[PDB]
Curated annotation (Swiss-Prot):
GO biological process, one term: proteolysis
Top-level lineage group: Eukaryota
Domain Peptidase A1 residue range list: 17-328
Protein name: Endothiapepsin
Active site: D35, S199
Gene expressing this chain: EAPA
Reactions mediated catalytically: Hydrolysis of proteins with specificity similar to that of pepsin A, prefers hydrophobic residues at P1 and P1', but does not cleave 14-Ala-|-Leu-15 in the B chain of insulin or Z-Glu-Tyr. Clots milk
Similarity comment: family membership: Belongs to the peptidase A1 family.
Protein EC: 3.4.23.22
Length: 330
């Protein structure tokens, strides 16, 4: 089997992407944030504290003939931006782009933090990291991809995120029309539960490539590219007027600036992030100061190849016995 679903930016900055997912019988369609940096499929629901729901579409398990409560099971998650959610657990039928998993753990939120409430466009998350990070207790549950794997034509999914445009998540096949040139594959460590890999270096604009190992994660659920302070300083040093602002929370630059591209290495291959992808717009409405899309990972504890990087590539998440990641230009 295979699946193919379009993913759509939630706003004009590509802050996140939403993908329609069918849950239950008859189908209830919710728009979920596919997150390769976490491993819980959780939804706003009929159980979510009423005051914490604001415009989201909710899953109502009592209206699904295929829903079953996983008795006694609970979940609770905290993300890198400090947001969180928690609740109880159902199993139900979940379909993405024509691909159906029966008995998928669907984690029903009883509580969500303010950032989730305040984002009316995101009805929940669909985790695509390794199931070892799943937060269900007492017994950890499998991700949608883990459950689908054995039925897939090939044990893979691909992320093809758009710049200011929709893109595609495919399951079970590689669309050879969706990229240019060849896909370069690179090793993955699952030791921390993430799609963790080592970039071979970087270049700024037309500069020479610096060969240096940068360990990080491929994370579709993080907006920006977070890299070591050395690398990030070297980038912004090439932008007139750029500076790190502690008050704003990162590097800012004059909105009038022309941003250089940023190249990262995948083995002997190279992915070029155009300068425009690094512009995240005014720091506040009407400001002539803009927020940078490449920021320091210092204090996160891990480097994160988030959407700014991933949307410059066609990315293969290969869930074979020995997992790998593939990157192609497009």
């Amino acid at each position: 089997s295979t699946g193919s679903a379009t993913t759509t930016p939630i706003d004009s900055l590509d802050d996140a992407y939403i993908t329609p997912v069918q849950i239950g019988t008859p189908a209830q369609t919710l728009n979920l944030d596919f997150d390769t940096g976490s491993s819980d499929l959780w939804v706003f629901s009929s159980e979510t504290t009423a005051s914490e729901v604001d415009g989201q579409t909710i899953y109502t398990p009592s209206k699904s003939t295929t829903a079953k409560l996983l008795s006694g099971a609970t979940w609770s998650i905290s993300y890198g931006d400090g947001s969180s959610s928690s609740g109880d657990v159902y199993t139900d039928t979940v379909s993405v782009g024509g691909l159906t998993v029966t008995g998928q753990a669907v984690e029903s939120a009883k509580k969500v933090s303010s950032s989730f409430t305040e984002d009316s466009t995101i009805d929940g998350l669909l985790g695509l990291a390794f199931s070892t990070l799943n937060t269900v207790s007492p017994t950890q549950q499998k991700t949608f991809f883990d459950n689908a794997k054995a039925s897939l034509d090939s044990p893979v999914f691909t992320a093809d995120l758009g710049y200011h445009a929709p893109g595609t998540y495919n399951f079970g096949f590689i669309d050879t029309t969706a990229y240019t040139g060849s896909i370069t594959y690179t090793a993955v460590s699952t030791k921390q539960g993430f799609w963790e890999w080592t970039s071979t270096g970087y270049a700024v604009g037309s500069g020479t490539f610096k060969s240096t190992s940068i360990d990080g994660i491929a994370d579709t659920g993080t907006t920006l590219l977070y890299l070591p302070a050395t690398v990030v300083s070297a980038y912004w040093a090439q932008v007139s007027g750029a500076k790190s602002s502690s008050s704003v929370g990162g590097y800012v630059f004059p909105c009038s600036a022309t941003l250089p591209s940023f190249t990262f290495g995948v083995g002997s291959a190279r992915i070029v992030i155009p300068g425009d992808y690094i512009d995240f717009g005014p720091i506040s409405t009407g400001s002539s100061s803009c927020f940078g899309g490449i920021q320091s990972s210092a204090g996160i504890g891990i480097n994160i190849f988030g959407d700014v990087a991933l949307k410059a590539a066609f990315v293969v998440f290969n869930g074979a016995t020995t997992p790998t990641l593939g990157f192609a230009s497009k």
